[PDB]
Amino acid sequence: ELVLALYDYQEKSPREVTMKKGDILTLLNSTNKDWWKVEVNDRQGFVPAAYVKKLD
C-alpha cells in the first residue's frame, strides 16, 4: 500500500505521473507487471514498477 520512489520519473504521457527520488507514494494498483498506478500529491497515475519499492 505504500511505495518508495527509487529514482526521479517525469510523466511522458497523459496516464503518467511525475515523482522524485525518496517520495512516498500510495499504491493504488499493481496488477500490471510494468506499470503501477499510484497517488502523488493528490494526482493519480502510472509509473514504472521497477522505479519503486513496496514497504509492507
Numbering used by the authors: 7 to 62
Question: What do the authors say?
Answer:
In this work, we report the first SSX experiments with viscous jets conducted at ALBA beamline BL13-XALOC. Small crystals (15–30 µm) of five soluble proteins (lysozyme, proteinase K, phycocyanin, insulin and α-spectrin-SH3 domain) were suspended in lipidic cubic phase (LCP) and delivered to the X-ray beam with a high-viscosity injector developed at Arizona State University. Complete data sets were collected from all proteins and their high-resolution structures determined. The high quality of the diffraction data collected from all five samples, and the lack of specific radiation damage in the structures obtained in this study, confirm that the current capabilities at the beamline enables atomic resolution determination of protein structures from microcrystals as small as 15 µm using viscous jets at room tem­per­ature.
